[PDB]
Structure formats: C-alpha cells, structure tokens
Design a protein around this ligand. Sequence first.
Ligand SMILES: [Zn+2]
Ligand SMILES: [Zn+2]
Lengths: 651, 661
Amino acid sequence: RQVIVPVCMPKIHYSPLKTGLCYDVRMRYHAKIFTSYFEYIDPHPEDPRRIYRIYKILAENGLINDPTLSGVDDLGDLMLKIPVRAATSEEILEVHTKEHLEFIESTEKMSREELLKETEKGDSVYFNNDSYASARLPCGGAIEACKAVVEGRVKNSLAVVRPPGHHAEPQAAGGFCLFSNVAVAAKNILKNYPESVRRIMILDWDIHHGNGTQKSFYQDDQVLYVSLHRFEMGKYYPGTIQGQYDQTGEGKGEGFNCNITWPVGGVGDAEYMWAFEQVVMPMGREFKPDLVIISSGFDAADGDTIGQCHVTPSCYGHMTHMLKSLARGNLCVVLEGGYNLDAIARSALSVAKVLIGEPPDELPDPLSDPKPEVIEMIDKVIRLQSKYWNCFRRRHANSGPINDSIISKNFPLQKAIRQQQQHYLSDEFNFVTLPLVSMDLPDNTVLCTPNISESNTIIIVVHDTSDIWAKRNVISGTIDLSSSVIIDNSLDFIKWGLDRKYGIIDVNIPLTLFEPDNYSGMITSQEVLIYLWDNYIKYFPSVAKIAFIGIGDSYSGIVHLLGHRDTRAVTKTVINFLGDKQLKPLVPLVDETLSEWYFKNSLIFSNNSHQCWKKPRKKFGRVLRCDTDGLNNIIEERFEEATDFILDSFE
Amino acid sequence: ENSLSTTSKSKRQVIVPVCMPKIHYSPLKTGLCYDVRMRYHAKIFTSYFEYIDPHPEDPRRIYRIYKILAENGLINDPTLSGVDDLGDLMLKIPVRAATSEEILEVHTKEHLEFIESTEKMSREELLKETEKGDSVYFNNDSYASARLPCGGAIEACKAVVEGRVKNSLAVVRPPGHHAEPQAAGGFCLFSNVAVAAKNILKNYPESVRRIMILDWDIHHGNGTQKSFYQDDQVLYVSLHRFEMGKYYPGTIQGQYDQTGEGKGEGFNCNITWPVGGVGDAEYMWAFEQVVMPMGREFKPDLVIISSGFDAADGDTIGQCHVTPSCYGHMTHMLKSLARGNLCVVLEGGYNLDAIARSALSVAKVLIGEPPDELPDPLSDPKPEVIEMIDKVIRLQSKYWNCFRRRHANSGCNFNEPINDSIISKNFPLQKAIRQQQQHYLSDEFNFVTLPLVSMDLPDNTVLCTPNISESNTIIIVVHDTSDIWAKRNVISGTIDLSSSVIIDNSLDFIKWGLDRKYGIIDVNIPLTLFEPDNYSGMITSQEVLIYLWDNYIKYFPSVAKIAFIGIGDSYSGIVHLLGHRDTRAVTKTVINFLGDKQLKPLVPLVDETLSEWYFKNSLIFSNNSHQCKKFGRVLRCDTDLNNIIEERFEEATDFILDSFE
Ligand SMILES: [Zn+2]
Ligand SMILES: [Zn+2]
C-alpha cells in the first residue's frame, strides 16, 4: 500500500509501426513491342510480371489480408502504402542531361517505327507508347519512399518497382532503364534536407552494373556507392569501366565508391554473406550513413536464367536483418531487375518477414565454402579503400611492387625442406638415399627404402616441394614467418607403404621459377623415370606390383614412362594428385590400347575450379573432379580410397 | 485527368479467406520474472556497520534495474512486487522451487544438505562458512528462498521452448557462474545457469538438443565451465579478463586455448582480455569475428544468454568502457543466428548504474527494436585484441569449416600435433630458416649455436659465433622472423613459393661484420613459437637478455665496444636491458631498423643518462609509409624497409666506423 510508481505510458521507439511498401498497378504497362519470335524463347528480360508474383507471395502468405490482389485502403496493422503521384523534372535533372529528358518527353508523341529506330540505337533497351509516367513514377516514388524513410514515417520501406533505373546514364541511357530512380532520390533527399539526410549509403547487388547510378554520385562524397555485379567487359551486359574496382570516386568522393564484380555466374550464399560481412559492415559504420538505399535485382539468384546462381532466399533475409541493424531503421530496400519469376518469390517471402520484424530463418546450406573468385576479388578493393579509409587500415595490416632486382642474393627456400624431410624420414622410417648419379639433381633427393631389389611391390612417390602455409600478422605489414607451417604432403602414403612393408622410393622435384607449368621439373621427371626404368628395374628380376604416385607436378614424366616404355609388364596402376596443375594426357603412340588401359586402371584427381568443368577426351583417362581444395585435402582425405583402389589393383 | 481508369464494376471474388496469419516470431511478448523472495539472503557483518557500502551481491540491484524498467512505463503495478498485470507489452513468469531432483542432477548431496544446514546454522557458524567457503555470503535463512533462483532458472525456459514467449530474461540473485557440484565461490549459492541449462534438455529432449551459451560477464563463468566441459551438445562462449590469476577467478581454465574436453571439444570458446579498459570497438569487432560464422555453421536450438555488465561504461571492477549501445547491438544481431531461441540471465554488473543503462538498452532492443548506432564509428581497437583473435581463429580450422577457406587457414590443420613428429605433417618453418641458416652459415663460415639451457624453449633457436669469449668486439644482431613478398593466395593461407622473395637483411650485417672480423650472437625471436601457448616473447626475450648480460657478457676477458643491432620489434627488449643494466662503458653503439613497427616504452633502471648515452649511441631508421627526444635519433627515411636498408646500411656502418674513426 506504500506506493513508488503510478500507471504510466510505455516508452519505445521502433515496432509499434508498420512496413511501408511501393507498388503500383500502372508500372506494368511499360513493355516490349513485338518484333521477333526469339523474344518468346528469351526469358522476357524485363518482364512486367515480376511485380505481382512477389505481390502474390506476400499477400497469400498471410502478411496482407486482401480479397482482390489490388488496392483496398484497409491495409491491416503491418503494411503502409506510399502514395505516388506524377512528379516533376528538376529532380530528374539533378542527374540527367535535359535533352535526355526531352528524348523521353518525345516518346509521349512518337510513332512506332521511331521507337524501333531508338531501340535499335539504344544499348539493349526497350520502350513503349506507355512509358512516360513509367519513367517518372519510379523516381518520384523513390523520393516519396525515402522522405518517409529518414523522418521515420515508415519503420522500413521497400519498392517492388519496375522499370529499373541503374542503366540510365545522364547523357543517353542504354540498358532497359528509362530514368534512374535511386540516384534522383539520393540527390533530392540531400538537397531537400541536409539536416536529417547527412550521408547515404547506396548498395546494389543487381548483377548488371549500376552505370546509371554510379556517375550521378561518382563525384559526390555524401553517397557511399557500393556496387555488386558481373563485370564481363563486353560479353554480359554492360561491362563499363565504371564497374571496375579502380572507381574509388572522384575528388571529394574519393573513397566513397566501392565496386565488387563477379567473374562467373553460379555462386551461392556465403559468397554474398562473407563478402557482406567483410566490406559492408565496417565502412557502413565508419562512413556513418543515415539511410542505406538497398538495391535488389533478381538477375542474381537461384533459378535465374542468366545469372544462374545458387543463392538462397535466407542469405537475402540475413543481409536484410544486418542492414536493418546497420541503419537505425532508415531502410529503403528497392528492386531493379529480374528474368525468372521463381527466384523472386522465395526471396521476397524470406525478406519481407524480416522487414516486418521477424528474424530470418536458419541457413539451408550453412556450408557454401565460397568460390575463390569471391575470395580473391575484394582484396584489391580493400587495398584502394585502405588507401582511403581508416576502417580497413590496421584491421588487416594495411597502412595506406617496388623492386625486382634483389633476386641474386636470396634465402634459397627449398634446401632445408628436403634436408628436414631427409632427417626425419631417415630416422623414423630410415630412408636410404640411393642416388641417381650421372644426372643433375641434389644428392639427398631420391630416398629409397633399403633392399628395394628384393622388395617386389614398389610404391614410388614423386612430388614437388612441400606446401608452405603461413600466417601474416595484423599489426604492421609483413608475414609472420615462424608460423609458416611446412605441409609435408608425402608422409601418410609412405606410412601406408611401410605399413604393408613395400619398397618405398620417394623423389622430390625442385620446381621451376615464375612459371605457369612446372616444365623443367617435368623434364627431369622424364630423366628420372626413363633412367630408373632403363637402368635398374629391368635388372631387378624379383619385381611385381609397382605403383607410381605423383603429387602435384611432373605427371608427364610418368606419362612418358607409360607411352614410351612398356613399364606395365611389372607396374599396374598410376596415382596422381594433380589438383590445380595442368593436364598431362597420355599421347597414343604405339596404339590407343595402352591409352585404353590407362583409361581403365589409373587415377588422376584435379580441382573443382581447375581448367575444365565450365565431356573431355579418353586420353586424359579418368580425371576426377574434387571440391575439397588443396593437395593436402585430398592427400589426408582420400587416403582410404587410394589404399582401396591400388590394393584392388594389387591383391 | 488520367488515361486508363479500369472498369471493375463487379463483386470482386475473394482470393484468400478469413484466417490467422503465418507469422512465426513476435505475436507474443517478453517474459519477465520477479519475486521479492530473492531479495532476502545477505551477509553477517563483524567489525563495523558495513551498510555504508552496498556489497557487490546485493538485494536491491534487481530492484534498481527493475525500477529503471518501472520508469519506462512497462509496469502498471504500484507496489513493484511480482504480479502479472502490467499493460500489453510483456508478460510475467511464475517461480516454483528448484526441487532436489531438479538440482541434484549435477550437485553433490553434501552441497544440498549443507545449504539446508546453513539454513539453520548459528551466527558464529554463518561467519565460519563465510570465511571457510570463500567469497560466499551467509545468514540464517537460505533454503526456503535459495530454491527459487534455480527454480525460476528452470521454469522460465519452458515458456520459451513451448512458444509462449519469443525470448525472455532472467533477473536473478545470487549468481551462478562460479558454482560447482562439490564447491562454490563468487557469491554463488547454486549454479543458476547450469541448473538453467541442463533441465530444458533433460525434461525435453524432444525439441532442443544443442544449446549455445553466451557469457560476457568479465569474471569467467568458471563453475559452469566445468559443468558442461565434456558435454558435446552445449557450445559455450565466455569473454573475460585473465590477468595471470589476479582477476577473479583467474585460473588456467579461464584461458582462450580451452577448446573443451573429451567429446566436448569445439564446444568451449574463451576470450581473454590481456588488458582492460575496452570499449565498444573490441566487442563489435569480436562479436562479428567468431560468434556469427560459427553460429551460422553450428545453428543451435537454444541460446542461453549469460549477461554481465561488469565491463560496462560506468562499472568499476571490470574497469572497461563498453557503452550500452554496444550491448544493444550485440542484443540485436543475435536474433538472426538462432531462430530467436534466446533467454537472458543476469550474471554480472556491480556498479548500480552501468548495469541499469546497459540492461535498459538490452530491454529496449529485445522488446523489438534496433539500438542506437555506435557514437564512435572510427573506433579503432587495441591491436593486441585483433592479435589474440587471430590466435582464436588460428586453431578453429582444426575443427570448423566456416573459419577455414575464408580466413586463409585451409592448408594447415592443427589436428596434426605441430612438431617434428610424423603425425604432424605440418612443420615449423622458423626451424627450417634456422636449420638452413645453421647449415648455410656452417658451410659458409663455420657458425655455431647457443643453448638456451635454463630457458623454456627448444635448443636450436639462437646462434652465435665460435669463441664469443675472445671476441673482443661484439655486434649483437637481434632479429625477428624475416620478410617475404608474394601474391596472396588468400583461399588457403598457403603461398606461391615462386612469387615469394625472402630477404635475409640481417645476414648482410653479419657479412659486413665479417668485413669487421668481430663477434656476433645471432639472437632470434620466433614470435612465441606457439607451443607453450600462454606466451609473450617480449618478456621472455628480456629474460634471455638478462640471461646473456648477467650470465655471460660482462664476465668476458677482453670485452669492449659492444654493438647492438635490433630489428623492429626485436629492438624492444634492448629498450629493456639497456634500461635495466648499465652497459655504457662497454657499448660503442646500438642500432635499430624499426620500419613501420610501433615505439617501445622506455624503462630505465640504473641512471638517467641512459637516454642521452643511447641518444649518442643510436642510429634508428624507420619506414616512409610508417610516417614516423628520449627515443634516440629516430630517422624516418625515404626510399621505402629494404630500400632504406640499402639506403641507410652505409649510414649505420659509417657511424660505426667513425665511432672507430
Ligand atoms: Zn536492375
Ligand atoms: Zn562480474
């Protein structure tokens, strides 16, 4: 009965609120006019049916009570309409040149054949008689959304809005894009309110390049322009030089542009997730945007006809949640592109429930293990932004190619590898160096098991040098060279051949320098292979069941033992961990029957992202695609399949 | 006005009927537990009336932050008791006792009867178990109201796994992160978090099997660390100070390298801060480093949130400056990582005000909001934080897939026991450098080693010249691991050996000293060698410097004119030893190529003309993209580091030979 508080009003800031949308029944009208029949077997590259499917997949999934799938003013208690009207033109010429807009103003009064001319002249464009308000209304809607965004009239806004804008360059467009929507929006919110709107991040992953949006703020500092697109400089549309990684901005805008390109289609989730969490979040702190305008486009998802990717809806909903986090609910998610109607619905169904306020779902594939163009793509981007920004300086030992002539005095980098190998394989497994003299190689490099003569079953392993893993430090620059580990990739099959007590011969090959294919290493592999079989092994009478095991390089010397010598009177099946190296096919020389025998009992293992697989001959002879990348990965991993295969080939 | 004006003069037929919508997070509201019966049990005071200071475990801290949430309109009840009716935005949790079958799953029975005995012990024995069982307060009423912290720790969670609440909290006293079966400590009566976290899986192993545990109370959750130590189902994360024993608890089990034990390995992740005073920068760094990718790679079914704001911006024991907006952002970004399978539990925060604003921010994130953004976005952590997090995501590739191939780790694998054995196929390359330069300088110039006998390292680490005793003039070239330059194969962390140019820049000073025919101790710093793993090569390299100077160098017959070439961070202990020992009559000079390394803090011990004698005796050269009186003639150079080594090598040897005239 002693009182400390009364009944009082609860005090929050976000979520009593409703999700604003941008949708129109008149945006469907700008369409392509009948010229060819190939356009039917084309995916209708900007089809107008990208809207309503998404507007189906949210309304019939419970998020909108609607009996009509059109406009009734009772929108429930989670969705807002944004009323878009016919806009004016000075907002458009914040970006555009004026006679670009007079070219668009003409199209209200042009006849048909003149648009067939100007679609022959426009760089993959399309027009219609009904394109005048469809040029203006996405831009005026992009302003009318963003005004509700940065004040916080909506808690979040999203635009299921066609046509796209990101190919509408100021002089003359090209790329199906009438006027730029987001660039007009981002100019006019800075120049209507530089009190609320102080800095804008524009991000895009519509996988055609935003050349209509880049040059609008290529000079500007207040827009951090992050773009994500396939480059493919002439082939895929468009390949500008504005899409390239060197475009860090201009003048005051230097560092306020960030291009991310994609060299191949068919990529997945943690490509975008891992790339997103590397670049998008720290500079999305340090840049301090108020609003990030978020540019979707369905040329890039799972099931797209052109992008052909593997990217889940869930990946999109997780980046929806973290850019909900990165802004303060200053969210304008906009849509640009799309070919398919089936990528769009699963992705919109994931993302719009995040923008109601649910967390996104757990990952259907949490293991993309992303494709290595994404891994080596963003590194030079971090180099130029670390030339401009604090948020990747010293976080990756960055600090904001200079000499090539110090080569003649150098720590020779391969001697103590094979000396160290020689000492532990000389004590633990006690390898006789049996030297192949009257040749050229260092001495302790051919290490055999003793009594190799009476040892019938001989396992030979030739390899390169050891693999060298390293740690590079993070505080200042260079590579922490102690924590370089020396991956001796030959130990386990040596332990298998001494587990079964075979004649083990190991040959290391010193590599060739600065060279794509390790060619003189292949030359001395033919010298080794021809010298061993033409000097001592026919003069071993007590011999059967030989297998050759090549790691990495120099397969063509053992190919030269097959196609140039009858070594298969004693040997049975050759093993190659090729991996990333170039294909060494067996040339058909005496016949193609020994190549057919090669095609029946041999093993070659190569990578996923190696030369092929983007079918081949029988003279390659059962080369096996591997998705666990590295020589070390298949040497530890398919130990067991190797010792089942060659003991299938033996007794 | 317009053109189209579509004619729909019809009864437009209904597509989807009257239905309840498919939303599946937040139609319901956050649960809150509160009872006055936790506000009872206290301490017995002896010397003076010690109600001047509130104790860090206190009956009013719950009512403090409960009053902070009473300020913000959430509670209609005037009494501020535990009742259910509050408005429409939260919901209250009831509490039954933890029964002895619910708490004796983990606990010894002696613990339960001992609490039941100190329920009725005498006041002298309340002081005796206060002094005997360390750091646990006692008073003559325990078991009638100690049943309820663990009891609510059970019974809040069954609303979560049923789906009667999105996610919730547990404001609770006493804590539970320093309590074991056989013992306790740390103001803990029972472990409220282990008897929060077992019971959901034991009473329901039909919806939840794997649980992740957050802990950022900067006292390490030590009693619960052993409670799930072999439990492979339960992944655990704790963030805490280490201090080598001195912060509480301060053990070897509060160390970053405890991955787990038995089958529970890879389910235990510790984070040690080597120095406090951290802010939002290191938490939003580390929170996106390890938590998010393995939290997507693992995907638990429930997350227990051990919450402690003893490192908050305003709190005194954790001494740190982490603002409430950081706590709100770490609240906000873990909704996505599970489905929302979250429950906060109160663990730490002993200033009355930092826990108030911090839990005020966590409350108005998880009642449905994003937090306020970070007020310093050019935030810039301590570099040793990122160094220790590099050593965190070092050994992650021996288990986890998300931390290899993206963070350049897939070539190595640390399930290889990293040694010159065969089961290691990974071999340390600083021994290959030193075996190569050992073999190389012995077939070149017959070069010998030292032992570090009585020093905890391996033997072939450090070298010297043959007959250093009659070497009357001694150069000491001090070096860290050298510097190679290649393309960055950034999938694996392996390199291309063909594109890689290693300079042994110190060897040029060695051969230049062979144009002087003078003595050399080739001192090497591998950066800790990673094998004792608790290790800082700074201080142990200073122990080597003590070991050389105070065991060998002064006691030499013709000793004179001693030169000292430290290289970068391997000049830092020369800041120590020259600071700590008087060498000034026998030193002619002391050389540094810093480059882009940091400056090293001057620690003098013998006289204050060390800085001026060292200012005479030093040529120090630093890099140009480095952009950099008592640190002794630090010359920034022009042409680059190895261009300024060929630019300033002549400068250094000309200063040495003009010290020789
Ligand atoms: Zn587009
Ligand atoms: Zn604490």
